[PDB]
Design a binder for this molecule. Structure first.
Ligand SMILES: CC(=O)N[C@H]1[C@H](O[C@H]2[C@@H](O)[C@@H](CO)O[C@@H](O[C@H]3[C@H](O)[C@@H](O)[C@H](O)O[C@@H]3CO)[C@@H]2O)O[C@H](CO)[C@@H](O[C@@H]2O[C@H](CO[C@]3(C(=O)O)C[C@H](O)[C@@H](NC(C)=O)[C@H]([C@H](O)[C@H](O)CO)O3)[C@H](O)[C@H](O)[C@H]2O)[C@@H]1O
Ligand SMILES: CC(=O)N[C@H]1[C@H](O[C@H]2[C@@H](O)[C@@H](CO)O[C@@H](O[C@H]3[C@H](O)[C@@H](O)[C@H](O)O[C@@H]3CO)[C@@H]2O)O[C@H](CO)[C@@H](O[C@@H]2O[C@H](CO[C@]3(C(=O)O)C[C@H](O)[C@@H](NC(C)=O)[C@H]([C@H](O)[C@H](O)CO)O3)[C@H](O)[C@H](O)[C@H]2O)[C@@H]1O
Ligand SMILES: CC(=O)N[C@H]1[C@H](O[C@H]2[C@@H](O)[C@@H](CO)O[C@@H](O[C@H]3[C@H](O)[C@@H](O)[C@H](O)O[C@@H]3CO)[C@@H]2O)O[C@H](CO)[C@@H](O[C@@H]2O[C@H](CO[C@]3(C(=O)O)C[C@H](O)[C@@H](NC(C)=O)[C@H]([C@H](O)[C@H](O)CO)O3)[C@H](O)[C@H](O)[C@H]2O)[C@@H]1O
Ligand SMILES: *[C@@H]1O[C@H](CO)[C@@H](O[C@@H]2O[C@H](CO)[C@@H](O)[C@H](O)[C@H]2NC(C)=O)[C@H](O)[C@H]1NC(C)=O
Ligand SMILES: *[C@@H]1O[C@H](CO)[C@@H](O[C@@H]2O[C@H](CO)[C@@H](O)[C@H](O)[C@H]2NC(C)=O)[C@H](O)[C@H]1NC(C)=O
Ligand SMILES: *[C@@H]1O[C@H](CO)[C@@H](O[C@@H]2O[C@H](CO)[C@@H](O)[C@H](O)[C@H]2NC(C)=O)[C@H](O)[C@H]1NC(C)=O
Ligand SMILES: *[C@@H]1O[C@H](CO)[C@@H](O[C@@H]2O[C@H](CO)[C@@H](O)[C@H](O)[C@H]2NC(C)=O)[C@H](O)[C@H]1NC(C)=O
Ligand SMILES: *[C@@H]1O[C@H](CO)[C@@H](O[C@@H]2O[C@H](CO)[C@@H](O)[C@H](O)[C@H]2NC(C)=O)[C@H](O)[C@H]1NC(C)=O
Ligand SMILES: *[C@@H]1O[C@H](CO)[C@@H](O[C@@H]2O[C@H](CO)[C@@H](O)[C@H](O)[C@H]2NC(C)=O)[C@H](O)[C@H]1NC(C)=O
Ligand SMILES: *[C@@H]1O[C@H](CO)[C@@H](O)[C@H](O)[C@H]1NC(C)=O
Ligand SMILES: *[C@@H]1O[C@H](CO)[C@@H](O)[C@H](O)[C@H]1NC(C)=O
Ligand SMILES: *[C@@H]1O[C@H](CO)[C@@H](O)[C@H](O)[C@H]1NC(C)=O
Ligand SMILES: *[C@@H]1O[C@H](CO)[C@@H](O)[C@H](O)[C@H]1NC(C)=O
Ligand SMILES: *[C@@H]1O[C@H](CO)[C@@H](O)[C@H](O)[C@H]1NC(C)=O
Ligand SMILES: *[C@@H]1O[C@H](CO)[C@@H](O)[C@H](O)[C@H]1NC(C)=O
Lengths: 488, 488, 488
C-alpha cells in the first residue's frame, strides 16, 4: 500500500501580504478595511438631529428659520452645507469653541429669566430678521435701546441658585456710525462688563461701516459666560448690550456635531461618518477620518486582506505545504488535511478532522481578536477646515495626520505578521499530521519524501482506517513488513 | 528499557493571551501593568514642594498665606485641591500659561529692583488681603495711587544688564466706578504700556462692578513680560498700574507641577502620580495618565500577563508540548525538561539542564528587554480640566486620548506576540531534546510516538546516564539491539 | 561515504538585536537609521528660496533689504539665523500664524490696487527704513498722515471680482506721544475697522514710548485679512492706518519654510533637514525631527541593524544552525548552505543553490518592504522655539515628543521581530535541506546527529552529485547498503 498525506487547495485563491512576500496566494482571506458606506445616516441607535437649513449656533441664538429647534436635544447634530444665516448679521469670536461646547452638551434647553431692564426699550427688531411677516430678532436675545432719549446705566444680577451650570449667551451691537450710536443708545461711549465671582468679560463697541448684509452695515458680536452653582451673573452696561433672555443648560455627555449632506434613514448602525453609516465588524475603515460612535479606526489603505487559510498550491518555515508535499488537493472539499491511499482494494481519499479543526480553531482565534472589536468615540476635534487660520489649525491637522499614519502602520504590520503566522501554523499542522502518521507506522513503512509512505504489508480498507483513526497496531504486521522491507 | 522525554507542569498555572488564544494556561507569568500606588508621594529623588493652601500663582504674587514660599525652588510643585486665594480678587488672562511657565522654571527666586515711581503714593493696601492683623497686598506687587490728588504720568525703565532672562509680574486695577477711578488715580482714563525692544503690551482698565469678593467689587488683572539680556523694560502709565517690585529668575529645567491630595512621605520612588508614587519596574501602568519622573506608560488595560513558562499541561507549532507528549510532569521540580526511564534496575526521573537553561535564558532575555526600562518625562500637558474651554482643550484631550489608545494597542500586541513566541520556543526546546536523543540512539531504539523510546538492549543506570550526558556509544550495543529489533 | 550538511559563516559578523537577545551575531546586517547629512541642502527637486538676510515676513512687507524677493515663489523658503529686520520697528500679533500661512502658500506674488485715499498725505517715510540713500518705508505698505492739518475719515472698498482669495496686509501706527498723535493724524483718537461680509477687525492705537529701535520709540502692529471671491474689503478709518497697496495671492500647495544655516548646493535629494539633505533609502533617521520632502521617519535611536544573514557561527527554534550543526563553514563562499563529503575519490564541498536562494529571496522580500519606502511630508508644525509661550507651545512640543516615542517604539519592535524571524527562517532552511537529503537516502544511510550522514555503500563523485541534484535512486544501492548496515 501507499499512504499519502496532503492538504486541500482551491482553484480561486486570494493574494495577501506577509513579512517576506508582497504577494502570496492563500485559500481564503477576509477584508479588514471597511471601504463603503450605505450612503445614509441610520437614525438608530444614536439620536440624530437634522439641522436642515440651520447651523447649531443659529438654532442656539433663535434665527427665525430655526424656531423648530427650541429646546431640542441630540446625540449627534447634523449640520448641512446648504445652511445659511438669515437674521441680524453677527460674528462670534471663537465661534468654533461655542459650537463645540453646545455640540457636546447635546441640548438647546432654555430657561427664561426675568431681568430688571429699568429705563430702556426692549425687544429691538430688524428687517434683516423676519419672523412672521414682520421685523424680528434672535429669539433668545433682547435688543435694548434708549427710552425717551435716555439710556440709564444697567446693573443687574442673577444668582445661580441651581445645582447645575448656566450658559448665558449675550452680545454687543456695533453701530455703523456715531450718529446711529447716539440715536440707539443716547450715548457716545457704550461699554459692557459681564462678570461672576470667577470671571469677567468687558467689551466696548467698535463703530464703523461693515459691508451690508440684508441691508445692515451694523454688526453684533456674540459672547458667552458660564455661571457655576452658588455664583452670580452681574451685567453692568451703559449701552450697546444685546441682552440674554435666560440661560441654556450646559450638560456633559457623549453628544457631538458632524457636517454631512447624507440623508437620514430608518435603519440601525453603530458607526456614523459624513458619508453615511458604515458597518463596524472590521477593525479598520478608509471611508472617513470623521466618525461618531463605535467605529473602525481610519487608515490610509483601501484594502488589507487577512489570510484565513493555508498557502494555496493548485492541482513556510515547516517545509511541508509548498514543500515536500508537491501540491494541494482541489478534490478534497470536506477537510483541510487528509490521506490518499492505494491498496489492494482500490484508491481513496479521507479528510483528517483533528488537524483540520486545529488549523481552523487557531484562525478563528485570530478572527475573534480582530472582528467586531471596535472602539467607541464621541465628540472629537475638527478634521476639515474651510478657512486658513494658522497655528492652532496647523496643530489640529498635524495631530490627525500623525495619528492616521500610526494607525495605518499598525494595520499594515498587523496583517503582515498575522498572515506570516497563518501560513506557518497551517504548514505546521500539515507537518504534524505527517509526523504522527510516520510514528504510527514504526518499522512497517518508509517515507518516500513526497509526503507518501510505502507500507510494506497488505493494508486493506480496515487497515487504512485503523491508521486514520489511530488504532493501528504495528505489531500485527511487523513480521510481514520487515520481511518485505529487508529482502535482497 | 524505555526512555521517555517530558517537561514539567504545575498544579496552579496562569492564564495568558496569545495571537490565537484569548485564554491559555502557562506554568508562570508576570504582570506588565502597574495597577497600584503606595498612596504617598515619596520625597526622594525629586525635590517636592507641598503647596498646602497655596496655588503656585498665589505663591508667585505673594498672597499673605504664602509668605513661606518666598524664593523656594522645586522639581515638582504639588498643588492641593483645598488651596484658595485670600488677597485682592484678581484674574490672569491665560492663567494656565503663567502657571505652566513658572512650574517648569522651578523657582520663585525674586530680585528687588528700584523703580522711580515719582509723584505717586506706593504700597496701596486692602482688607481683602490681611497680612499680620492689618490691610496688606500681594508682596511682590506695588499698588500705586494719587499723591496730593495728582497722578503724574509714569515712564520708567530697567535695562536687563544680566546674563539671564527676567520675568516681570505686573497688573492693572479695574475700579468698580468712575468715582473710585477718580479718587484712586485722579484721572478718568488710565492706560498702561509695558514694552521692550522685542515686545509691547498695552492695557486699559475696564470700569464696572464685579460681584464682591472679601467685600471688593473691584478687580486686578495680572500680566507678565520676559526681558531678554541686553533688552530694556519700559513702563509708561498714567494710572491703574499695579507695579512690579522686581523680577523672578526664569530658568529652563525639568521642573513641573501636579494637582494631588496625596500626602508626602519619607521614601524613595522615581515615578510620581497624583495617586502617589508607583514602582517603575513594569513597562506599563494603569494608575494615572498624569505622571512625573521615570514612569511606566499609561494604558487602559488593568492587567497584561507575560508568559514566563511553557504551556501548562497538568498530570504550539512544534507539536511536542500538548502534542505527541501527552502531558507535563508535576513531579519534575528541578528542571523544565527531562527524562523518565524504566530499565532492569528500576524507574527514575532526571532533569535536562542544557535544554532547561536554553528556555530560561530566552525568557530572561525577553524580560530584560521589558522590565526596568521606563522612560523619563517631566513637564507635560494638562490632562484634567475643571471648566469647559472649547477648541484648545478639545485638542489637549484628543492628543492624550490618541496617545493612550496607541500605547494600549502597543501593549496588547506586544504581550500577545511575546506569549505566542514563548509557547513556541518552549515547545521547540522540548522537540529539540527529543530529536537529539533519538539521534543518539541510532538503530538501537524506536520512537513509540508518545515521546518515549523503546531501547532494544539492556540499558542499566550507567547506560541511561550515558544517554543523558551524551556519551552513549551506540556501537557498543548495536549488535544486541539489531538482534532484538529485527527478530521474527 | 560521509555526507555532511552545513551552512556558511564569516570571520567578521555583525551584532543585532532580537526578541530574546540584546546582542547576537549574524553574517550580515543593514542599517535602518540614517544618521548623517551631506551638510548641504540640495536644490533639486524642491525649489529652494534662500532668505539670506531676510525673514519671510520682511520679504512680505517689503523691508528694503528684501526688494529682491518681490513676487518670488518657493517650495521651501529657507530662513537664516543671521536674518534681521531693518525698517520701521513693528510687531505682528500671531506672527507665527502669518509666517505659517505665507510659507505654505509658497508665493509673494503681489497685485497693486488703487485705493481712494482722499484728503490724506501718502507715502510716509522714516530714516529707520533706508532704501536708496533716503528715508523709505515697507514697499507694500502706505503710511497715511494729515494733509493741511486735516485727516478726513477714510471709507474705501475693494470688491474681490477675482476667482481666488486675496490676502491683504495692513497695519496700525502706535505713536509714542499724544503730541506725535496730533501732529501725524490731526486727531486725538484714531480708530481702524477693516471688514468683509464674513469678518471684521477693529484696532485702536496705543500711545506711549517703547524702547527706541533705529531711533524710533513708535511702533507699527501688522494685521491681515483674507477676502473671498464675491466679497468686499471695506476699510473705514479716522487715523493711524498703515494702508495696503494691494493684495497677495494666497495659494494652497506643498510649500513650507525651514530655519537652517546649511548652504544650498547643486545636487539632488528628496529629503531636506536643517542640517542638510539626507538620503531617504532607509525607513528611519536620527538627523533631525524637522524635515521636508519624502523623508525617513525621525527616531531617537542612532542605529538599528536589520539582519540580512543567518546566525554567524565561526569555524533558533529549528535547532540546526548553532544546534546539531556544530558550526558554520567560512570556506564556503559561493552559497549559504551546502554539502561536504568524503568518499573513495576524496573530500569536497558544494553549495546548494535552491536553499540558498530560498533564504535570500525571503530576506530580499523583507528589505523590499522596508527600503526606499519613505513617506512625503510638507508644511508641518514648528518643532523648535526661541521663546517661552505657554499652553499652545506646550501642546506643540508634547505632540511631537509623543509621535517620536511611538515611532521609536515602532522601529525598535520592528527590527527585533524581523531579526528573530530572519534567524529562524535561515535555521529552518538549513533544517529543510537536511530533512530532504535524509529522505533521499532512505535506508542507505544513517544520521550521525551532527548534520552528517554515514552512507553505507560506495558513493563516488557521480553518486554524491546525484544526491545534490536530487536524482539519486536509492534502489540502486539498497542491497549493498542494507548488507553493510545490518551486519553482526
Ligand atoms: C435708531 C434708528 O432708527 N436709526 C435709523 C435712522 O433714524 C434717523 C431718522 O429717524 C431721522 C429722521 O427722523 O432722525 C434721526 O435721529 C434724530 C432724532 O429724530 C431726534 O430726535 C434727535 O434728537 O436728533 C437726531 C438727528 O440725528 C435718526 O438717526 O435713519 C436711518 C435712515 O432711515 C436708518 O437707517 C436705515 O435702517 C434700515 C434698517 O432699519 C432697522 C432694521 O434693522 O430693520 C429698523 C430697526 O427698527 C432698527 N432697530 C432698532 C432697535 O433700532 C434698526 C437699527 O437701527 C439698525 O439695524 C442698527 O444699525 O434699523 C436700513 O438699514 C436702511 O439701509 C437704513 O438707511 C436708521 O435705522
Ligand atoms: C480711594 C478710596 O479710598 N475710595 C473709598 C471711598 O472713598 C470716598 C470717601 O472717602 C469720601 C468721604 O471722604 O470721599 C470720596 O472722595 C472725595 C474726596 O474726599 C475729595 O477730596 C474729592 O475732591 O472729591 C471726592 C468726592 O467723590 C471717596 O471716594 O469711600 C468708599 C466708602 O467708604 C470706599 O468703599 C469702601 O471700600 C472698602 C474697602 O476699602 C479699601 C480696601 O480694599 O481695603 C481701603 C483701601 O485702603 C483702598 N486701597 C487703596 C490703595 O486705595 C481700597 C481701594 O480703594 C479699593 O479696593 C478699590 O476698589 O479700598 C469696602 O470695599 C467697602 O465695601 C466700600 O464701601 C472706597 O474704598
Ligand atoms: C509728524 C512729525 O514730523 N513729528 C516730529 C516732530 O515734529 C514737531 C516739530 O516739527 C515742531 C517744530 O516744527 O513742530 C511740532 O508740531 C507743531 C506744528 O509745527 C504746528 O503746525 C502745530 O499747529 O502745532 C505743533 C506743536 O506741537 C512737531 O510735533 O518733531 C520731533 C523732533 O524733531 C520729531 O521726532 C524726531 O523724529 C525722528 C524720526 O523722524 C521721522 C522718521 O521716522 O524718520 C521723520 C519722518 O518723516 C516721520 N514720518 C512721517 C510719516 O511723519 C516720522 C514719524 O513722525 C515717526 O516715526 C513716528 O514716530 O519721524 C527721530 O525719531 C528723532 O529721535 C525724533 O526726535 C518728530 O518725528
Ligand atoms: C462707507 O462706504 C460704503 C460704500 O462703499 C457705504 O455703504 C454703501 O452704501 C450704499 C448706499 O448708501 C448701499 O446701497 C451699499 O450697499 C453700501 N455698500 C456696502 C457694500 O456696504 C457706507 O455707507 C460708507 N460709510 C459711511 C457711513 O459713509
Ligand atoms: C454700572 O451700573 C451703575 C448703575 O447702577 C453705573 O453707575 C451709575 O451710572 C449713572 C448713569 O451713567 C451715574 O449717573 C450714577 O452716578 C451711577 N450710579 C452709582 C450708584 O454709581 C455704572 O456706570 C455702570 N457701569 C458700567 C460698566 O456701565
Ligand atoms: C451693581 O449691583 C450690585 C448689587 O447687585 C451692587 O453690589 C452689591 O452692593 C451691596 C451693598 O452696597 C453689597 O452688600 C453686595 O454685596 C453687592 N453685591 C454683589 C454680589 O456684588 C453694586 O454696587 C451695583 N453697582 C453700582 C456701582 O451701583
Ligand atoms: C508716558 O510717559 C510720559 C511722561 O514722562 C507721558 O508724557 C507726559 O505726560 C504728562 C502728564 O500727562 C504731560 O503733561 C506731559 O506733557 C508729557 N511729557 C512729555 C515729556 O511728553 C505720557 O503720557 C506717558 N504715556 C502713557 C502711555 O501713559
Ligand atoms: C520715557 O523714557 C525714555 C527714557 O528711558 C525716553 O526715551 C529715551 O530718550 C532719550 C533722549 O530723548 C533717547 O536718546 C533714548 O534712546 C531713549 N531711551 C530708550 C531706551 O528708548 C522716552 O522719551 C520717555 N518718554 C517720554 C515721551 O517722555
Ligand atoms: C467711516 O467713514 C465715514 C467717512 O466716510 C465716517 O463718517 C464721517 O466722518 C466725518 C469726519 O469725522 C464726519 O464729519 C461725517 O459726518 C461722517 N460722514 C458720514 C457720511 O457719516 C466714519 O467716521 C468712519 N468711521 C471710522 C470707523 O473711522
Ligand atoms: C466620503 O467622504 C469623503 C469626504 O468628502 C470623501 O473624500 C470620500 O471619498 C468619501 N468616500 C466614500 C467611500 O463614500
Ligand atoms: C431651506 O432653504 C431653501 C432655500 O432658501 C428653501 O427652499 C427650503 O424650503 C428650506 N428647507 C427647509 C428644510 O425648510
Ligand atoms: C488614581 O487617581 C485617578 C484620578 O482620580 C483615579 O480615577 C484612579 O482610579 C486612582 N487609582 C488608584 C489605583 O489609586
Ligand atoms: C489651610 O487653611 C485651613 C482652612 O482655612 C486652615 O484651617 C489650615 O490651618 C491651613 N493649613 C495650613 C497648611 O496652614
Ligand atoms: C542636526 O541639527 C540638530 C539641531 O541643531 C542637531 O542637534 C543634530 O545633532 C545635528 N545632527 C547632524 C547629524 O548633523
Ligand atoms: C547681510 O547682512 C550682513 C551684515 O549686516 C552684510 O555684511 C551682508 O552683505 C548681507 N548679506 C547679503 C546676503 O546681502
Amino acid at each position: 500500500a501507499t499512504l499519502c498525506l496532503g492538504h486541500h487547495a482551491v482553484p480561486n485563491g486570494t493574494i495577501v501580504k506577509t513579512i517576506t512576500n508582497d504577494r502570496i496566494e492563500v485559500t481564503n482571506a477576509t477584508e479588514l478595511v471597511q471601504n463603503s458606506s450605505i450612503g445614509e445616516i441610520c437614525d438608530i441607535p444614536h439620536q440624530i438631529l437634522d439641522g436642515g437649513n440651520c447651523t447649531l449656533i443659529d438654532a442656539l441664538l433663535g434665527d427665525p428659520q430655526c424656531d423648530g429647534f427650541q429646546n431640542k436635544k441630540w446625540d449627534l447634530f447634523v449640520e448641512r452645507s446648504r445652511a445659511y444665516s438669515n437674521c441680524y448679521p453677527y460674528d462670534v469670536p471663537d465661534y468654533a469653541s461655542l459650537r463645540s461646547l453646545v455640540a457636546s452638551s447635546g441640548t438647546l434647553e432654555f430657561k427664561n429669566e426675568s431681568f430688571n431692564w429699568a429705563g430702556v426699550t426692549q425687544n429691538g427688531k430688524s428687517s434683516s430678521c423676519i419672523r412672521g411677516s414682520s421685523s424680528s430678532f434672535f429669539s433668545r436675545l433682547n435688543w435694548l435701546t434708549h427710552l425717551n432719549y435716555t439710556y440709564p446705566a444697567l446693573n443687574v444680577t442673577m444668582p445661580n441658585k441651581e445645582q447645575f451650570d448656566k450658559l448665558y449667551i449675550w452680545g454687543v451691537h456695533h453701530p455703523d456710525t456715531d450718529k446711529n450710536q447716539i440715536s440707539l443708545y443716547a450715548q457716545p461711549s457704550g461699554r459692557i462688563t459681564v462678570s461672576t465671582k470667577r470671571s469677567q468679560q468687558a467689551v466696548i463697541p467698535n463703530i464703523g461701516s461693515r459691508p451690508r448684509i440684508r441691508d445692515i452695515p451694523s454688526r453684533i458680536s456674540i459672547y458667552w459666560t458660564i455661571v457655576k452653582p452658588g455664583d452670580i451673573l452681574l451685567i453692568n452696561s451703559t449701552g450697546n448690550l444685546i441682552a440674554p433672555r435666560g440661560y441654556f443648560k450646559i450638560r456633559s455627555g457623549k453628544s457631538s456635531i458632524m457636517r454631512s449632506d447624507a440623508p437620514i434613514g430608518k435603519c440601525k448602525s453603530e458607526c456614523i461618518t459624513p458619508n453615511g453609516s458604515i458597518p463596524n465588524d472590521k477593525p479598520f475603515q478608509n471611508v472617513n477620518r470623521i466618525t461618531y460612535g463605535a467605529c473602525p479606526r481610519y487608515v490610509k489603505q483601501s484594502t488589507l486582506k487577512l489570510a484565513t487559510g493555508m498557502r494555496n498550491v493548485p492541482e513556510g518555515i515547516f517545509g511541508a505545504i509548498a514543500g515536500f508535499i508537491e501540491n494541494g488537493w482541489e478534490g478534497m472539499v470536506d477537510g483541510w488535511y487528509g490521506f490518499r491511499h492505494q491498496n489492494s482494494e482500490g484508491r481513496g481519499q479521507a479528510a483528517d478532522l483533528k488537524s483540520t479543526q486545529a488549523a481552523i480553531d487557531q484562525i478563528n482565534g485570530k478572527l475573534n481578536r480582530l472582528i467586531g472589536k471596535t472602539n467607541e468615540k464621541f465628540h472629537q476635534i475638527e478634521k476639515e477646515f474651510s478657512e486658513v487660520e494658522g497655528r492652532v489649525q496647523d496643530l489640529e491637522k498635524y495631530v490627525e495626520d500623525t495619528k492616521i499614519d500610526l494607525w495605518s502602520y499598525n494595520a499594515e504590520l498587523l496583517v503582515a505578521l498575522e498572515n506570516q503566522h497563518t501560513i506557518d501554523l497551517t504548514d505546521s499542522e500539515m507537518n504534524k499530521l505527517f509526523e504522527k502518521t510516520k510514528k504510527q507506522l514504526r518499522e512497517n513503512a518508509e517515507d518516500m519524501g513526497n509526503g507518501c509512505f510505502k507500507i510494506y504489508h497488505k493494508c486493506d480498507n480496515a487497515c487504512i482506517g485503523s491508521i486514520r483513526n489511530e488504532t493501528y497496531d504495528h505489531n500485527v504486521y511487523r513480521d510481514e513488513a520487515l520481511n518485505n522491507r529487508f529482502q535482497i
